[PDB]
Design an enzyme around this catalytic site. Structure first.
Site, PDB file in Angstrom:
ATOM      1  N   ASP A   1       0.777  -1.234   0.000  1.00 16.91           N
ATOM      2  CA  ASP A   1       0.000   0.000   0.000  1.00 16.91           C
ATOM      3  C   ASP A   1       0.808   1.285   0.000  1.00 16.91           C
ATOM      4  OD1 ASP A   1      -1.343   2.269   1.881  1.00 16.91           O
ATOM      5  OD2 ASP A   1      -2.925   1.271   0.729  1.00 16.91           O
TER       6      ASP A   1
ATOM      7  N   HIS B   1      -7.826   9.462  -1.726  1.00 16.57           N
ATOM      8  CA  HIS B   1      -7.107   9.512  -0.454  1.00 16.57           C
ATOM      9  C   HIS B   1      -7.798  10.206   0.720  1.00 16.57           C
ATOM     10  CE1 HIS B   1      -2.688   9.271   1.111  1.00 16.57           C
ATOM     11  NE2 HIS B   1      -3.563   8.970   2.054  1.00 16.57           N
TER      12      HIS B   1
ATOM     13  N   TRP C   1       1.486  15.265  13.117  1.00 18.64           N
ATOM     14  CA  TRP C   1       0.342  14.487  12.658  1.00 18.64           C
ATOM     15  C   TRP C   1      -0.376  13.735  13.772  1.00 18.64           C
ATOM     16  CZ3 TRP C   1      -0.681  16.249   8.065  1.00 18.64           C
ATOM     17  CH2 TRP C   1       0.379  16.734   7.276  1.00 18.64           C
TER      18      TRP C   1
END
Ligand code: NDP
EC number: 1.1.1.-
Length: 322
Positions: A49, A116, A226
């Protein structure tokens, strides 16, 4: 071996139930992606992925091309996934984005192409475009039009299957209830682990025969800004560690197996050779109904990746319950 565990997608294609994640924090050299993917394939991973936004497709593509060229594996035994980044949500820019990724990978097609993230940003080379005052340059795009362009990519043979990522109940229903819909998304890749098991979204996906693909299944890269560094460490959880000790496995393995037994296709990222080989052990044991229930009880309903810099626009997916 020549065989491995896969599930049938709603479009007839098959997806290996264990995938290798390739995202790695900026500080990490891209060269590592090349070595890591080759080891993953060597260890038995048949699902890889990636995404344009990870800026590693050149490296990931080489790894795949290398293992095919030396006879280790055949192209049809590699399930490769890429994702359409938000700066290319506009219909006319979808195919060019897929073709750009394919050029970087030097592959003829991707086995899976995903939208996405549901929030769109202005076109251009910059993945996160900002104006002179640091404001992200959001764009207004009809995702239903983005999807039609995705469907055309499937019909062109550039993508075998098409799906989404980070979509919530509302957004999925929007695509599913779309007039003239040709292909339902085969999956919805979202954050999923024992602290955020997505029970509700999981059942919804099941009712529509959409495969839920779990990322950050091991607690995520925990990369700042993040992820909040104050967030609990999944693999350190006492119950997972107890189960690990009981089965003579590892907390990571318990967490991966958990997903497989609840009908979820799971991803696992690791650039460490030993941990890469270790992860494929998920097919070497099984959890009882009681153990599964014990893991269900760990749900904290706390999300590791909120990606709030994209919060504000209507399409931000994490405001709704699910
Ligand atoms: N579609 C989307 O929006 C997103 C998709 N993703 C995808 O999900 C993948 C995985 O997510 P993240 O990247 O979140 O990764 P994971 O949550 O799968 O892994 C987190 C950490 O687990 C460690 N680890 C791996 N195996 C073991 C083990 N056996 N025992 C102990 N620790 C272990 C790794 O360290 P080490 O490498 O040192 O082994 C890694 O840093 C990504 O690479 C990407 O492909 C991620 C974010 C968003």
């Amino acid at each position: 071996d020549s065989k491995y565990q896969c599930v049938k997608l709603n479009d007839g294609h098959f997806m290996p139930v264990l995938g290798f994640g390739t995202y790695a924090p900026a500080e990490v050299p891209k060269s590592k992606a090349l070595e890591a993917v080759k080891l993953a394939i060597e260890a038995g991973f048949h699902h890889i992925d990636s995404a344009h936004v990870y800026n590693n497709e050149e490296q990931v593509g080489l790894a795949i091309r290398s293992k095919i060229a030396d006879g280790s594996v055949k192209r049809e035994d590699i399930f490769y996934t890429s994702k359409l980044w938000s700066n290319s949500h506009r219909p006319e820019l979808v195919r060019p984005a897929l073709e750009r990724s394919l050029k970087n990978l030097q592959l003829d097609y991707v086995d899976l192409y995903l939208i996405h993230f549901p929030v769109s940003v202005k076109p251009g080379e910059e993945v996160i475009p900002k104006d002179e005052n640091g404001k992200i340059l959001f764009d207004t795009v009809d995702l239903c039009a983005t999807w039609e362009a995705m469907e055309k990519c499937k019909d062109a043979g550039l993508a075998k299957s098409i799906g989404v990522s980070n979509f919530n109940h509302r957004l999925l229903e929007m695509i599913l209830n779309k007039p003239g819909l040709k292909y339902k998304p085969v999956c919805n890749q979202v954050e999923c682990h024992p602290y955020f098991n997505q029970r509700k979204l999981l059942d919804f996906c099941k009712s529509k025969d959409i495969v839920l693909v779990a990322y950050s299944a091991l607690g995520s890269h925990r990369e700042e800004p993040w992820v909040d560094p104050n967030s609990p460490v999944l693999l350190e959880d006492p119950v997972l560690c107890a189960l690990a000790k009981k089965h003579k496995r590892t907390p990571a393995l318990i967490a991966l197996r958990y997903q497989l037994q609840r009908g979820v296709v799971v991803l696992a990222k690791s650039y460490n050779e030993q941990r890469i080989r270790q992860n494929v052990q998920v097919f070497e044991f099984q959890l009882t109904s009681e153990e599964m229930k014990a893991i269900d009880g760990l749900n904290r309903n706390v999300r590791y990746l909120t990606l709030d810099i994209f919060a504000g626009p209507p399409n931000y997916p994490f405001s709704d319950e699910y």
